[PDB]
Structure 1
Amino acid sequence: ERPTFYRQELNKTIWEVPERYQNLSPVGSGAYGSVCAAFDTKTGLRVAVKKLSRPFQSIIHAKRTYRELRLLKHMKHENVIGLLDVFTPARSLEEFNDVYLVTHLMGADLNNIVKCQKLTDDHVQFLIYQILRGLKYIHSADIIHRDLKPSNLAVNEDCELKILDFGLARHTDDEMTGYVATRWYRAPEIMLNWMHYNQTVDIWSVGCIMAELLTGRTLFPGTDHIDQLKLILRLVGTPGAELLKKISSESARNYIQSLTQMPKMNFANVFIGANPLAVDLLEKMLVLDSDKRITAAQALAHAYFAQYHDPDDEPVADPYDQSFESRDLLIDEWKSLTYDEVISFVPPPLD
């Protein structure tokens, strides 16, 4: 219909939001967008309201914005970030210039939870089961997260987990240099752009996380791109001819071929004392050849999640049309598409 908005400045940022959102409290403003915690009188939930800064200041930003709303609008799974609401103070496409997105306020991320030490195998089972369940859903819609890491997994007081911060959007630049956590979870093939990557890059990420939850230590904390690849090949062994034939860059193949060949290590001797089913699963996730990596759907069926696996309660997504990525529009055409999606949004029904 059209709710009543109320203007108000916070941390020198103007927030014009509907009255249903109350007690707006700054909670960290990144370059991507300003964030606020608030209470949503209509759902009863404490929420996170992100105000995108300059959503249409460029064709790429304008397309990123569009991409993010389309993405958040489609995601409907217990283990994936959902869109509770999206809105703009603008009454016309003419003045339409700001985008706000609302979602359940997630308290702590996976870091907080592991930071203190390794957890019980039972908790490792639960947490990883949830990441794979949401990932099965995400992949089913032909989507690739691209940036799975502890800080992008929100965990609640009962160890319930939601996946967020989809890669699809940002363009990891100069942020992957040096001894940085952001890169420690990337599959090698995408890290050194050996080839055009698939969804198993996400499975590689889960394996890195699973190992860290078991040992309480980062698996491949390389000090740079090369040191990290070296840490990965020491564990997984160097590429074989089969894999090498799949790396595009004649330079990457050349480089790889300059490295003394190494055999795969014994994971049992790496993850000492870990449940054998866990080790077996890690060996299936941490495979150099991405074509041979295990899938989310397959992993769920692995005997490591016997206590949680239920094929009937592990949904897939509705088909997700991403043809707009090959679309060539102008800022304004992206803007209007964004606006149509803002205007068309239908809220998730609560009881």
Structure 2
Amino acid sequence: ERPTFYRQELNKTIWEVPERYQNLSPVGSGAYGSVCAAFDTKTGLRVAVKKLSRPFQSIIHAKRTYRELRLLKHMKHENVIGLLDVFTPARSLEEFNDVYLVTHLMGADLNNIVKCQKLTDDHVQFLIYQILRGLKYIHSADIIHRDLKPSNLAVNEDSELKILDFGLARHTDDEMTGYVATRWYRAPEIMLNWMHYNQTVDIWSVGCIMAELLTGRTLFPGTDHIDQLKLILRLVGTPGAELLKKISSESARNYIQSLTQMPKMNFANVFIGANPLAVDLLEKMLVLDSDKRITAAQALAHAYFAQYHDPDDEPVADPYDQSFESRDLLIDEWKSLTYDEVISFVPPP
């Protein structure tokens, strides 16, 4: 039941997609250069189509392509970017060499919606509520986003939000260097590789985001890794004995201990004028020891979200098999696994 595809030049490249998708138009430069907005005449939805080009140029890239497709095919939640469609114009494994991923078009990220601006409390409640609802879902499948920030939070004009780019974070040292937003939302244990981190790193990121929505200012705009750690410890206090032991990196632990001790600050005096419940929640998300941070599920039941919380409408995910991550395969093997996933795709109802 192969649909009919048509060709078209976009961003100096040839896009070949099923007829149902019309009015393709590039959305931007940079990482936005492989994405086009379109109208899906079959569903009547405005969609976004990302073309993965030469997804099998290397072992590493072939595995990345498989990883992204597996992740996107697994997500079926209102606050998480998922797949409306995935296709290839190829008629056989032999010819298979391009992957196209179709999802909802939100049209903007949280920055474009808040950069340098303080939001009303109700608006912050709604936005953080959705981030946590989708994060609850993501974590329930044992998936860690690990690189949550405003630029990876897609929002439409009705302020509805979908989390994207989860479990794909593979930044370069250079990209994390200096005065850059790419590192401002990262939990300290991951920024400085203190220990084997887990999903709790994502809660730290939500706290950073929430504070920014409330004040209109970056919470920890470090000029570098060290300056940022300093900004963090000034607010949340230097590690206690118990946490120091959990820092398996003897190198990191040793540096940490060289710092003059500091007590956690009073958040009510940092976030002056903010809803006391929002302040309480920030204190529970921005805890240095990741073991003690509130979880997405717990945060959803926090009073700050009374107006939105509904325990019967905050679903969890089916289990996500990521055994492939520890597997070393050849390019063709990773390519063949990707092909099976493409052809076995079942459209959402």
- What TM-score range do you get, normalising by the shorter chain? over 0.9
C-alpha displacement of 1:30:
3.8
Per the normalisation by structure 2, the TM-score is 0.98
Question: For residues 286-317 of structure 1, what are the alpha-carbon distances to aligned partners after superposition, in whole Å with 9 as ceiling and x for unaligned?
Answer: 00000111100000011110111111100000
SS at match of 1:182: helix
Q: 1:52, 1:99 within 8 Å by CA — same for their partners in 2?
A: yes
C-alpha separation in 2, matches of 1:26 and 1:124? 31
Q: 1:8, 1:16 within 8 Å by CA — same for their partners in 2?
A: yes
Question: For residues 230-286 of structure 1, what are the alpha-carbon distances to aligned partners after superposition, in whole Å with 9 as ceiling and x for unaligned?
Answer: 000000000011000011121111100000000000000000010111000000000
C-alpha separation in 2, matches of 1:170 and 1:63? 13
Question: For residues 20-49 of structure 1, what are the alpha-carbon distances to aligned partners after superposition, in whole Å with 9 as ceiling and x for unaligned?
Answer: 111111112545961111111111111111
Q: 1:148, 1:185 within 8 Å by CA — same for their partners in 2?
A: yes
Q: 2:27, 2:33 within 8 Å by CA — same for their partners in 1?
A: no
Per the normalisation by structure 1, the TM-score is 0.97
C-alpha separation in 2, matches of 1:45 and 1:262? 53
SS at match of 2:348: coil
C-alpha displacement of 1:76:
0.3
C-alpha displacement of 1:71:
0.3
Q: 1:29, 1:35 within 8 Å by CA — same for their partners in 2?
A: no
C-alpha separation in 2, matches of 1:324 and 1:32? 28
Q: 1:144, 1:168 within 8 Å by CA — same for their partners in 2?
A: no
**Unmatched segments (≥5 aa) in structure 2:** none
> What do you get for the CA RMSD once the two structures are aligned?
1.2
SS at match of 1:183: helix
Q: 1:32, 1:52 within 8 Å by CA — same for their partners in 2?
A: no
C-alpha separation in 2, matches of 1:243 and 1:154? 35
Q: 1:185, 1:204 within 8 Å by CA — same for their partners in 2?
A: yes
Q: 1:234, 1:265 within 8 Å by CA — same for their partners in 2?
A: yes
C-alpha separation in 2, matches of 1:31 and 1:220? 25
1:65–1:30 CA distance, 2 compared to 1 (3 A): farther
Question: For residues 119-151 of structure 1, what are the alpha-carbon distances to aligned partners after superposition, in whole Å with 9 as ceiling and x for unaligned?
Answer: 111111111011000000000000000111111
Among the aligned pairs, what percent are the same residue? 100
C-alpha separation in 2, matches of 1:81 and 1:291? 28
SS at match of 2:272: coil
C-alpha separation in 1, matches of 2:185 and 2:257? 24
Asked whether 1:167 is paired with 2:163, we answer no
Q: 2:26, 2:33 within 8 Å by CA — same for their partners in 1?
A: no
Question: For residues 63-100 of structure 1, what are the alpha-carbon distances to aligned partners after superposition, in whole Å with 9 as ceiling and x for unaligned?
Answer: 11000000000000000001010000100000100000
Question: For residues 198-254 of structure 1, what are the alpha-carbon distances to aligned partners after superposition, in whole Å with 9 as ceiling and x for unaligned?
Answer: 101000000000000111100000000000000000000000110000111211111
